[PDB]
């Protein structure tokens with residue numbers, strides 16, 4: 071039940087709520103007040119989904135889907151079989167995610183480490199909240215939120231995107247995408263570079279970080295360094311998500327026409343709007 | 352407020368770092384570039400040296416030729432007018448030959464010939480660049496992980512511009528060179544194949560793309576959270592585990608009930624990343640060669 | 654059909670890859686132990702991988718993992734409950750004893766070396782000719798702890814040569830000796846360096862280094878563990 075080096079770290083302390091009341095583990099898992107909160111929220115949420123499944127009349131995971139209130143309910147309550155369950159499951163999800171982040175903070179404090187991890191996770195939570203809470207509220211109805219189902223949530227992405235034409239033309243979406251692709255690129259290279267150093271050609275000694283800098287300067291004329299790469303992966307992945315949330319929060323609110331038409335502002339600039347030739351003359 | 356190690360508070364500099372020698376032909380290395388204090392807030396201040404070499408030159412010349420061929424066509428589409436060039440920059444497009452030319456090299460310059468020439472240059476640029484990622488590791492005695500990883504990106508690329516067109520019987524299936532047009536091509540590809548959301552390899556590619564950001568956010572944040580114990584010195588933590596690697600593993604064991612090592616996180620990393628383009632390339636390559644309509648295929652599972 | 658074949662194959666491949674990855678990541682810390690240090694009955698469904706060996710540079714030897722695990726140091730903690738899963742109370746001063754968030758690992762009592770075989774980390778005074786290139790130069794500033802008292806003054810910065818970065822501040826105490834403070838644990842301000850982790854009376858307790866111009870992987874761990882431990886353990890002497 072313990073890693074060989076684990077015991078010296080399992081001291082008391084670090085909790086945010088409850089003093090020593092929940093300061094303990096179950097197998098590998100730390101508990102804490104927020105472990106209890108997470109269990110409660112997640113448990114209710116899952117039970118409510120299983121109840122929503124009965125009211126839908128299916129048990130197949132590819133078919134279970136919990137849809138938010140239809141648009142006519144606005145921002146109000148809805149009968150359970152018709153949107154109410156979604157609404158309660160969403161409060162449960164939120165409670166679970168935030169509890170999970172706060173439990174991570176208790177773990178950081180016990181371990182004497184920086185808070186970077188729950189801080190990073192809070193970006194994902196902010197993205198979920200943009201879709202299920204912030205955007206629907208600004209738009210005036212819960213029904214603009216995505217439904218909880220494996221394929222139905224995809225139907226929502228497709229339908230929502232094509233409401234605005236080819237969603238590729240959302241410029242915040244272009245930036246988000248660029249961060250996603252760049253992040254995967256940098257993840258590949260970081261993993262590969264560390265491993266190429268740690269696992270050199272047969273019979274050779276482990277290479278050093280000096281070799282890692284060298285390899286990347288040889289290759290592209292720069293190396294960000296070992297601190298920098300971890301700063302970078304973190305920045306790229308949080309930026310991707312910041313821009314994801316941004317790209318959606320602005321859609322259906324400040325911009326609601328076809329995203330491709332947004333780009334006319336540049337073509338219509340007085341200096342060149344009226345010169346013939348090219349694509350737009 | 353405590354210091355968070357996102358940006359450095361104090362930079363230091365010493366003699367330009369010329370790098371490890373090992374088996375590298377030193378005649379082929381530039382001098383050092385300048386030193387960017389701006390960069391140094393976040394990463395290393397030093398630029399260069401870079402390695403040149405014969406393959407290097409070839410790859411760069413080829414890459415330029417690809418870039419210039421597209422840009423020449425763009426200027427032409429702009430009727431040589433600077434103002435129209437900038438106005439319409441994202442709208443220009445160098446397009447592959449029409450279906451009727453099939454796989455032949457016999458289309459006119461203005462109607463696909465130029466596309467093939469640009470593509471030719473892109474092909475030698477990328478592959479000789481691949482050669483360089485292998486060769487620069489070799490000369491340093493390092494593993495070949497970078498070149499193996501790069502090969503997975505190359506695979507989606509080769510599938511899109513080369514292998515899928517060949518299997519379909521025409522260059523018209525390939526992607527055009529343009530900012531907006533490559534996007535239109537992408538949206539169209541999905542429409543014409545019954546919605547890529549029903550392609551299991553597209554959904555896998557997404558799981559991995561999102562998984563990469565999840566994992567890089569996790570790893571990057573973890574290393575920074577343990578940088579106060581020297582956590583980013585990962586190679587020496589692998590050789591001689593410290594309290595950084597242990598606090599890191601235990602953060603995760605305690606949170607989610609399992610954990611990595613300092614070396615093995617890097618393997619979860621490389622694989623999470625390469626599988627984006629591995630599964631992606633497969634999903635595209637199957638699209639239209641074997642499966643005409645993902646929604647249809649999905650209804651039969653087979 | 655071929656797509657069906659590819660997808661079924663992929664999932665088999667992926668199960669194999671996850672198995673490979675989880676077992677690679679069992680090269681340290683396993684087998685699992687009970688709280689008393691004996692092998693736990695339940696090791697889980699993944700077995701240990703075959704050993705691999707890393708050849709270390711500069712005559713430092715090799716590392717083979719998995720291998721026998723031991724702490725190689727005394728752990729001054731005791732149970733607080735009669736069953737598994739509860740915290741272990743420090744039996745003395747956890748800062749002095751190096752447990753909890755004050756923990757250190759029995760790393761090699763040698764300095765990390767760069768690719769040329771020289772000490773990776775050196776005081777800047779001995780690093781030719783490294784200098785501050787941007788930001789407030791901390792050298793000469795008073796050092797303040799979380800009790801808002803002055804603990805000493807910065808007399809140098811220890812720098813990583815091959816990576817050109819600041820790693821520690823060397824701080825001189827009232828008695829004329831120095832300590833290392835991790836760069837990540839200090840805040841360089843215009844008139845001072847502020848250290849939230851430690852009150853000023855804890856500075857003398859920071860683990861000392863044996864030679865004044867180098868620091869070993871073991872000494873770094875003890876210094877860094879001790880300073881981080883102050884977050885939890887100096888909290889009574891801190892201080893809104």
Ligand code: BCL
Pocket residue numbers: 238243244245247248249251252255508511526530533534537
């Ligand atoms: C995966 C399915 C589609 C596709 C779908 C999309 C979608 C959707 C989006 C992009 C976006 C991008 N795509 Mg695309 N993309 C495809 C294949 C590619 C290929 C290729 C196969 O060689 C290339 C070069 C590009 C490149 C581009 C960039 C213009 C842009 C950001 C990429 C990035 O962050 O990379 C990683 C970062 C790097 C380190 C290198 C990238 C640097 C860029 C600037 C160079 C690429 C082209 C370059 C000539 C453009 C210069 C602009 C001016 C003409 C000077 N795409 C295929 C066909 N791509 C985003 C965009 O902003 O589009 C406008 C976007 O929203």
Ligand code: BCL
Pocket residue numbers: 167194195196197198200201226227228229230231232236237238243246247250311313314315317318537
């Ligand atoms: C036809 C469809 C449209 C489309 C319309 C849309 C729409 C609509 C949306 C996007 C959004 C996204 N699109 Mg798009 N877009 C399309 C084309 C693409 C293409 C492409 C190559 O063509 C790409 C690369 C992208 C990429 C992007 C991303 C920038 C973004 C999704 C990531 C994200 O929001 O993360 C954010 C991460 C999360 C929300 C996850 C958070 C989860 C956390 C908090 C908790 C989960 C815990 C729990 C339940 C797990 C279970 C516990 C178990 C024990 C494991 N789109 C086409 C043009 N796109 C979305 C976006 O930005 O959303 C904000 C969005 O809503």
Ligand code: BCL
Pocket residue numbers: 116119198201216220221223224227548553554555557558559561562565
């Ligand atoms: C982010 C922008 C869009 C959206 C765009 C898309 C698109 C497009 C696709 C997915 C796909 C996925 N999405 Mg989605 N997705 C959205 C928000 C979510 C949220 C959420 C915010 O709570 C969740 C939990 C999911 C989860 C899912 C998975 C079923 C599937 C693979 C994801 C993945 O590997 O992520 C990366 C994270 C990891 C690798 C960690 C693993 C965690 C996963 C496996 C958790 C699964 C949870 C699920 C089975 C049930 C959760 C509830 C339980 C009762 C606890 N999506 C919003 C609406 N998503 C893909 C799919 O194939 O769907 C069929 C796909 O093509």
Ligand code: BCL
Pocket residue numbers: 227251254473476477504505507508511536537538539540541546547548552553556557560627628630631632634635
């Ligand atoms: C309307 C749009 C369609 C759709 C159509 C497509 C199509 C078509 C494709 C994808 C593909 C992808 N889609 Mg999709 N996509 C849909 C909706 C989404 C959504 C969403 C709704 O949220 C998401 C998250 C995604 C996400 C994804 C990615 C998982 C995947 C591309 C991975 C990649 O890294 O490629 C980026 C990486 C590369 C392109 C490889 C780069 C090649 C190397 C060699 C670079 C050479 C560059 C060099 C020469 C240039 C130098 C310039 C520098 C400045 C030096 N899609 C909808 C349903 N999608 C791709 C895929 O694999 O599908 C299975 C793909 O072909």
Ligand SMILES: CC[C@H]1c2cc3[nH]c4c(c3C)C(=O)[C@H](C(=O)OC)c4c3nc(cc4[nH]c(cc(n2)[C@@H]1C)c(C(C)=O)c4C)[C@@H](C)[C@@H]3CCC(=O)OC/C=C(\C)CCC[C@H](C)CCC[C@H](C)CCCC(C)C
Pocket residue numbers: 108111112115116159162163164166167170174187188190191193194217218219220223307308311561562564565568569572606607
């Ligand atoms: C911000 C950058 C990226 C990121 C970062 C991030 N994610 C994080 C963290 C970080 C740093 C972790 O600390 C935390 C973690 O512990 O990881 C292992 C986590 C995490 N990210 C996770 C998932 C996840 N992250 C995602 C994405 C991202 N996370 C971003 C791309 C996605 C995507 C892309 O779709 C998913 C699916 C989990 C593995 C984990 C948090 C687990 C957790 O909160 O557990 C507590 C709650 C439960 C155990 C279950 C709650 C059940 C609900 C009450 C009911 C379900 C409702 C749900 C809304 C229905 C969904 C149905 C779907 C079909 C849509």
Ligand SMILES: CC[C@H]1c2cc3[nH]c4c(c3C)C(=O)[C@H](C(=O)OC)c4c3nc(cc4[nH]c(cc(n2)[C@@H]1C)c(C(C)=O)c4C)[C@@H](C)[C@@H]3CCC(=O)OC/C=C(\C)CCC[C@H](C)CCC[C@H](C)CCCC(C)C
Pocket residue numbers: 251252254255258259262289290410411413414415418476477478480481484497498500501502503504624625626627628
């Ligand atoms: C595993 C999946 C991910 C991935 C991985 C990946 N990419 C790779 C590799 C790997 C591991 C690298 O080894 C290789 C690399 O060298 O990275 C630094 C690379 C790479 N991926 C790149 C781009 C890229 N990768 C893509 C992304 C991805 N790559 C996936 C998400 C994308 C997307 C998302 O579309 C882009 C656009 C390059 C940065 C690099 C491959 C470089 C290359 O093939 O070069 C060929 C052409 C040239 C040599 C130059 C081209 C000409 C330029 C247009 C001119 C402008 C600059 C010029 C060089 C200036 C010259 C001036 C002088 C005269 C002074």
Ligand SMILES: COC(C)(C)C/C=C/C(C)=C/C=C/C(C)=C/C=C/C(C)=C/C=C\C=C(C)\C=C\C=C(/C)CC/C=C(\C)CCC=C(C)C
Pocket residue numbers: 418419421422423425467470471473474508509510511512513526527528529530533
């Ligand atoms: C200022 O003006 C100048 C002219 C000086 C410079 C400006 C230039 C400009 C504006 C350039 C702009 C370039 C742009 C916008 C390019 C964008 C390209 C994009 C977005 C590419 C996206 C997809 C590319 C793919 C998938 C291509 C794949 C290519 C291959 C796999 C190569 C296949 C090889 C073929 C078909 C040739 C076969 C030949 C043999 C025999 C091997």
Ligand SMILES: COC1=C(OC)C(=O)C(C/C=C(/C)CCC=C(C)C)=C(C)C1=O
Pocket residue numbers: 255256257259260263282283286292293294295299394
């Ligand atoms: C293997 O790890 C990596 C580094 O290598 C040691 C890097 O160097 C970079 C390059 C990062 C940046 C900031 C490019 C911009 C720099 C200039 C010249 C302005 C990436 C992506 C990376 O993955």
Ligand SMILES: CCCCCCCCCCCC[N+](C)(C)[O-]
Pocket residue numbers: 241242244245248530
């Ligand atoms: C030409 C695209 C180059 C790829 C880099 C990122 C793409 C985003 C381009 C859109 C710029 C957004 N904005 C608002 C500044 O116009």
Ligand SMILES: CCCCCCCCCCCC[N+](C)(C)[O-]
Pocket residue numbers: 245248249252
């Ligand atoms: C190398 C890291 C920089 C990201 C490069 C990827 C292209 C995305 C465009 C960057 C635009 C960001 N911003 C905030 C300036 O608009």
Ligand SMILES: CCCCCCCCCCCC[N+](C)(C)[O-]
Pocket residue numbers: 358359360389390392393394788
């Ligand atoms: C891609 C790297 C470029 C990013 C440069 C950002 C510079 C930020 C400088 C902040 C300095 C903070 N402070 C207070 C210590 O000076």
Ligand SMILES: CCCCCCCCCCCC[N+](C)(C)[O-]
Pocket residue numbers: 290291292381382383384385398399400401
């Ligand atoms: C993707 C990063 C590209 C960075 C390119 C850096 C080029 C370094 C220039 C070195 C030239 C030095 N010099 C003039 C002495 O030869």
Ligand SMILES: CCCCCCCCCCCC[N+](C)(C)[O-]
Pocket residue numbers: 550551552553554555558562619622623671
């Ligand atoms: C590095 C390995 C991590 C494995 C993560 C795999 C997540 C699986 C998500 C299911 C995707 C479903 N589908 C049908 C689109 O393939």
Ligand SMILES: CCCCCCCCCCCC[N+](C)(C)[O-]
Pocket residue numbers: 097098607608609
């Ligand atoms: C893809 C999501 C699947 C959910 C399973 C999560 C994996 C956690 C494995 C740790 C199990 C903990 N333990 C030691 C009690 O077995």
Ligand SMILES: CCCCCCCCCCCC[N+](C)(C)[O-]
Pocket residue numbers: 608609610671675696697698699
């Ligand atoms: C995305 C990959 C999903 C797989 C992650 C689940 C693997 C759990 C491994 C748990 C094993 C922990 N244990 C018992 C060896 O200590």
Ligand SMILES: [Fe+3]
Pocket residue numbers: 260264300570574585617
């Ligand atoms: Fe790393």
